[PDB]
Design a binder for this molecule. Sequence first.
Ligand code: HEM
Ligand code: HEM
Lengths: 165, 165
Amino acid sequence: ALVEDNNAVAVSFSEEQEALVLKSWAILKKDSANIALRFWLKIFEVAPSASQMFSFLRNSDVPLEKNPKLKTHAMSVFVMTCEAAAQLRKAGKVTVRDTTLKRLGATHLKYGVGDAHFEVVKFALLDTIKEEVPADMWSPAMKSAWSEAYDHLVAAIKQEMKPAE
Amino acid sequence: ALVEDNNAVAVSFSEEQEALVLKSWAILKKDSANIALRFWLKIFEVAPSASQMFSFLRNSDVPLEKNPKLKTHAMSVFVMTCEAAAQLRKAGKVTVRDTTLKRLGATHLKYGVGDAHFEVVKFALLDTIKEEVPADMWSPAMKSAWSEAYDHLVAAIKQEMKPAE
Ligand code: HEM
Ligand code: HEM
């Protein structure tokens, strides 16, 4: 089927699917400061207006945009997506805490984050892993793993953005 | 563009710029069907939710290659965007008949097109072209002539998506 999210319906996310999303994260982990610049400059590239939801460039003294509410948020996508994949395999579904997902719902709704923003971030997510990881650990199998993860994350948050069920 | 913009937008567009657009548009024409098919597939990769605004009942044409709505729309983005090149150059403004620009805004406003979809189409526009023309012919200027034309043709449709103000 093609529903918003599998709340209780059969999602097999194999031990191997999860293995790819962890290992590769671990590689990017090491070069976290740099990749998160290239990840954001890839988003700013596709949809420069997306990077209006934070603020113009002021920290260390350059229009590079070394601001901390980005480096931190870049890490939330990537860490929160790894915690998604990790979840899918054990339970079959995204079960983040109610405070945290209630919280993300209202943040994203307040800042106008639409459907088109979630997908240009996943584009850039995938692209930055493709790009950073060796061409030899990267496969289609690994893009779907992170796709699935992200896809089910964004779906739990988007249901926090509209009224009752 | 902005160097002092109010109601006379400083539209500097050289003949050389229009010359880059048109030469790279000759190439795309020697295989329009297949290139128009790699354009909407680049946008559906970046923003799924985008091609799901053509989505499918009247024509019953579930696949992508199937609906004419996309091939035709790939054409006009490219054709129209090539025409704003010619206009900028020759007039220093998009001179699309006022009626067509008002129909164009009433159509995209009606369909939930924001800045993110206009930019994503431009990113794919520019990846398409980069991918079709010979690595020799492509130059950041050629990329830059096509960004200009598109940006100021979108600014024209946008003006008719917003109050008079
Ligand atoms: C599903 C993927 C994403 C995750 C896991 C995520 C996570 C977070 C988290 C944890 C926060 C912290 C702020 C708070 O909790 O009050 C946040 C803030 C925010 N997010 Fe996301 N986010 C995601 C995708 C996106 C996307 C696609 C956009 C748009 C490009 C976006 C735009 C924002 C904005 C504007 C803020 C507020 C930060 C500020 O202004 O200082 N997020 N996000
Ligand atoms: C400046 C670039 C673009 C050009 C030149 C263009 C041109 C047009 C034209 C001429 C139409 C046909 C209806 C009419 O106006 O009589 C149309 C339809 C449409 N456009 Fe665009 N467009 C552009 C960008 C976009 C973008 C960026 C989106 C969003 C992904 C979009 C989404 C649509 C949709 C959903 C329709 C309706 C199709 C139909 O009614 O048959 N357009 N556009």
